[PDB]
């Protein structure tokens, strides 16, 4: 028996606060990314990297913010963008009500253990079965071109694609993702937190806001809320595997 009452309006106001902050912190939204991927935009058509020749041509014709071997140059562009993403996600976290009022050490811990889960959530927005938008939508690198990179680089992005194809089938929008990402950041189970209860209290309010968002926005998926908590569980495992690949790479390359 859902009612539009003061409590529900406050949850819609929190949802709008997070959406507006998400738009401010993250230049390329899912709406704009999907417009590019489906050829439904007036913006510049991305240059497609689908083989070694189009990569060499792309390095010139795509304008990257960053300044030997192909696989390593690609991994380094990936590393640079990931640094920029940590800054954007941090800027977003500072807008979540209650976050900057937590103990700084806890804010740092929440971001340290949360940013990779948010990175692969937000990468799904930029992905389809064919490939991924790069350079803020100026380029598109294919999934199979990435898989063709020599070991250990060929298997670096493939689990993120596998996750994305299933995640994107839920058809979440930016209003949904803004709350989803805030729920992930305010996880009271991160290792080494000092003060868990104030994190859980914020997360409880974000979970209420998410549940209401998904009921209003997704009339034909009654258990989408449960499905998204399932994905947050899956992202844990994905990031475990990702940090294992990073160790191999940092060590051996």
């Amino acid at each position: 028996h859902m009612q539009l009452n003061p409590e529900s309006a406050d949850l819609r106001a929190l949802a709008k606060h997070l959406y507006d902050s998400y738009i401010k912190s993250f230049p390329l939204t899912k709406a704009k990314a999907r417009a590019i991927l489906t050829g439904k935009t007036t913006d510049k058509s991305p240059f497609v990297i689908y083989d070694m020749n189009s990569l060499m041509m792309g390095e010139d014709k795509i304008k990257f913010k960053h300044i030997k071997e192909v696989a390593i140059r690609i991994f380094q562009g990936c590393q640079f963008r990931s640094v920029e993403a940590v800054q954007e996600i941090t800027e977003y976290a500072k807008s979540i009500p209650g976050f900057v009022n937590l103990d700084l050490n806890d804010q740092v811990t929440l971001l340290k253990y949360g940013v990779h889960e948010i990175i692969y959530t937000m990468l799904a927005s930029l992905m389809n079965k064919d490939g991924v938008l790069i350079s803020e939508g100026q380029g598109f690198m294919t999934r199979e071109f990435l898989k063709s990179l020599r070991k250990p680089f060929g298997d670096f992005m493939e689990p993120k694609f596998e996750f994305a194809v299933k995640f994107n089938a839920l058809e979440l929008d930016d209003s949904d993702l803004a709350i989803f990402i805030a729920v992930i950041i305010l996880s009271g189970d991160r290792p080494g937190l000092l003060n868990v209860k104030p994190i859980e209290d914020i997360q409880d309010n974000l979970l209420q806001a998410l549940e209401l968002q998904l009921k209003l926005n997704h009339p034909e998926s009654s258990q989408l809320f449960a499905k998204l908590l399932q994905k947050m569980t899956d992202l844990r495992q994905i990031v475990t595997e990702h940090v294992q690949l990073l160790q191999v790479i940092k060590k051996t390359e």
Partner: peptide, 13 residues
Amino acid sequence: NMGLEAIIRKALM
């Protein structure tokens, strides 16, 4: 990890 913490503290300040 030390790198990641350093960037987060920088972005937070």
